[PDB]
Swiss-Prot record:
The TPR repeat-binding motif mediates interaction with TPR repeat-containing proteins like the co-chaperone STUB1. The chain holds residues 18 to 223 of 732 of the full protein. This is Heat shock protein HSP 90-alpha. ISGylated. S-nitrosylated; negatively regulates the ATPase activity and the activation of eNOS by HSP90AA1. ATP binds at N35, D77, K96, F122. The modification N6-acetyllysine is found at K42, K68. Homodimer. Identified in NR3C1/GCR steroid receptor-chaperone complexes formed at least by NR3C1, HSP90AA1 and a variety of proteins containing TPR repeats such as FKBP4, FKBP5, PPID, PPP5C or STIP1. Forms a complex containing HSP90AA1, TSC1 and TSC2; TSC1 is required to recruit TCS2 to the complex. The closed form interacts (via the middle domain and TPR repeat-binding motif) with co-chaperone TSC1 (via C-terminus). Interacts with TOM34. Interacts with TERT; the interaction, together with PTGES3, is required for correct assembly and stabilization of the TERT holoenzyme complex. Molecular chaperone that promotes the maturation, structural maintenance and proper regulation of specific target proteins involved for instance in cell cycle control and signal transduction. Undergoes a functional cycle that is linked to its ATPase activity which is essential for its chaperone activity. This cycle probably induces conformational changes in the client proteins, thereby causing their activation. Interacts dynamically with various co-chaperones that modulate its substrate recognition, ATPase cycle and chaperone function. Changing D77A: Impaired ATP-binding. Strong interaction with HIF1A, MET, KEAP1 and RHOBTB2. Loss of interaction with HSF1 and ERBB2. Los of interaction with TSC1. It is found in: Nucleus; Cytoplasm; Melanosome; Cell membrane.
Length: 207
């Protein structure tokens, strides 16, 4: 396991998301489903030029998996996935520029719910999660786990868990007071409100 320091801007945004009083937390799910939809659009479009890009799995879908025992909500997609260079380097560049634009928009009066317009909607996960684990597999790299509890740090390691084929899993280790996001009725309500027109099947698993 390798440990990395967040740069100052994204660290400040993570603190803002964790510390600011903001009741409309449910938008995290819309943001993660939108990210999954974008990752699925990316592999689908690349497959139109190279169909062998789907040799790692033809199915293009999004699954929402609650686990009350573990207190986790997992968003799984079979999208393009992320390489190690995406996790450490490329997304660090995006996190910096998107945070600077979002902070400029917030100081002006924008709402936390607009985070996805700045390309950093992933970070809305910290509205509900004390820790986020991202398991990912891109066709051109190995399976990796990125993880952070906001210490000013994150970790990256090769993942020895169940092999994924291709795509990303975002595991939300929920805060103690955010267990409503494990309830079937609550998840169904949020998906219907914010994500009813996503162009991939969204399966809400139950227990
Ligand atoms: O979906 C996203 C996402 C969306 C937008 C920005 C970053 C991420 C992101 C994501 C998933 C896994 C890791 C990162 C990530 N944030 C970083 C911050 N500083 C250094 C490396 C980093 N890598």
């Amino acid at each position: 396991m390798e440990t990395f320091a967040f740069q100052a801007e994204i660290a400040q945004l993570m603190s803002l998301i964790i510390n600011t009083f903001y009741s409309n937390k449910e938008i995290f799910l819309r943001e993660l489903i939108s990210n999954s939809s974008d990752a699925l659009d990316k592999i689908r479009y690349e497959s139109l030029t190279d169909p062998s890009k789907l040799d790692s799995g033809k199915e293009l879908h999004i699954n929402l998996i609650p686990n009350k025992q573990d207190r986790t909500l997992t968003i799984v997609d079979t999208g393009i996935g992320m390489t190690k260079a995406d996790l450490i380097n490329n997304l660090g560049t995006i996190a910096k520029s998107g945070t600077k634009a979002f902070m400029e928009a917030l100081q002006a009066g924008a709402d936390i719910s607009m985070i996805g317009q700045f390309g950093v909607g992933f970070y809305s996960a910290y509205l509900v999660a004390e820790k986020v684990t991202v398991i990912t597999k891109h066709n051109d790299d190995e399976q990796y786990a990125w993880e952070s509890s906001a210490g000013g740090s994150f970790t990256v390691r090769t993942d020895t868990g169940e092999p994924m084929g291709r795509g990303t899993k975002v595991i939300l280790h929920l805060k103690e007071d955010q267990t409503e996001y494990l309830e079937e009725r609550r998840i169904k309500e949020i998906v219907k409100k914010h994500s009813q027109f996503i162009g991939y099947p969204i399966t809400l698993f139950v227990e």
